[PDB]
Amino acid sequence: LADDHIYVTSSGGSFLENVRKHMAEPFEKQSGVKVTLVPGTNPAHALKILSSRGTPPYDVAAFGGNDMYRLIRAKKLAQVDEKSVPSLADVPEKFKADWEGCGSLYDYSSVGIAYRPDKIQGGVKSWKEFVERTVAGEFGKQVFFNNLSSNVRGAEVLSMFGKIYGSGYGDIEASIATLERMKPHIFKFFTAFNDPVVLLTSGEGAIGPGWDGRTFIAEDSTKGMVKWVDPTEGAVSSGPVMAVVKGGKEDLAKAFMNYALGEEAQKAFCEAMYYGAVNRKVQYSEKLKHRLPSIDSVQLVDTALLIKNMSALLDLWNKRIA
């Protein structure tokens, strides 16, 4: 009994409350295994796990991709597969690809194009249309864009530009060159996740990159004043990673991970948070069914690639953008 207790990292606020409500609590009920969610930042959790000697403080590593990649590089995560974590069979490979058989994204949020229909009737259908219409001056100077230095998925959006206009996600010249074309029409490089909704709803901005869930919430509360585009090339999606910590209570941890990635918990958590589920079995309520981008369509950029190119990308940015 005393040993049937696992520790699982988490962040804070609404995310953590919803992990508790939709993953930790239901699991405890079905398994009899107590779950403690430990609030903290990505870097702090990772360093703590990195630094650990003997019995690890945490059994399940659940946090951001950048810092999780640290634990991957340092061999701190246990191997998992469809034998040990059956739910992994229902998770498409792209959500697992970066983690060397030791992890999976456990939700995804998606950057698409958010806009005001009263400024842009019918909006746009693609990143390419967004770019070319911006450059043609059709939106005036009412476009906003992710600030690269602000950790608001700027690198990710630019990667899509590299792919559409260049040789792929790693073509930072093409990425920067695209944005450089748009620069005259951009009035704000935003620095927070909530910025697209505020810029749009205040009337200051007409269009720019925004998150599906966040925009859906605004669309609902505002009776359609803002809308989100699932771009034809695909939305660019990211999410937190879940992994079993080597040397922890690995069997209980795998059991929790199996539940968290399972259809029931994925649906409950993702519906509550307006996120996309990484389990392909999940079927959505009417609130999301028609607008959440398809699990098969969303694009994920290689974590290792983003980390490797960040310095050069920033340099080019500082040279040609800011």
Q: According to the 3-state scheme, what is the secondary structure of 227-272?
A: EEECCCCCCEEECCEEEEECCCCHHHHHHHHHHHCCHHHHHHHHHH
* Token pair 């993953």 in the structure block, residue: 23
Domain boundaries, the chain: 1-109+238-292, 110-237+293-322
Distant-in-sequence, close-in-space partners of 256: CB < 8 Å, separation ≥ 6: 6, 8, 23, 27, 31, 33, 35, 59, 60
Rg (CA), the chain: 20
Copy the structure tokens of residue 9. Answer: 């990292």
Classified by CATH at the fold level, domain 110-237+293-322 comes out as D-Maltodextrin-Binding Protein; domain 2 (3.40.190)
Copy the structure tokens of residue 171. Answer: 């073509």
CATH architecture label of 1-109+238-292: 3-Layer(aba) Sandwich (3.40)
Q: Resolution of the experimental model in angstroms, please?
A: 2.0
From residue 216, how far is each of 22, 92, 190, 221, 306 by CA, in Å? 21, 25, 19, 9, 27
Distant-in-sequence, close-in-space partners of 1: CB < 8 Å, separation ≥ 6: none
Three-class DSSP category at 308: helix
> What's the one-letter identity of residue 190?
F
| Whole-angstrom distance, CA of residue 140 vs CA of residue 121 | 15
Fold: same for 1-109+238-292 and 110-237+293-322? yes
The DSSP letter of residue 78 is: -
Residue-level length of the chain: 322
| Whole-angstrom distance, CA of residue 304 vs CA of residue 195 | 27
**Is residue 23 within 8 Å of residue 265, measured between CB atoms?**
yes
Classify 234 in phi/psi space as left (phi over 0), alpha (psi -120 to 50) or beta.
left
| Whole-angstrom distance, CA of residue 61 vs CA of residue 64 | 10
| Whole-angstrom distance, CA of residue 208 vs CA of residue 111 | 10
**Is residue 141 within 8 Å of residue 184, measured between CB atoms?**
yes
**Is residue 196 within 8 Å of residue 111, measured between CB atoms?**
no
| Whole-angstrom distance, CA of residue 5 vs CA of residue 200 | 45
- Taking the CB of residue 39, how many other CB atoms lie within 10 A of it? 13
Distant-in-sequence, close-in-space partners of 34: CB < 8 Å, separation ≥ 6: 4, 5, 6, 28
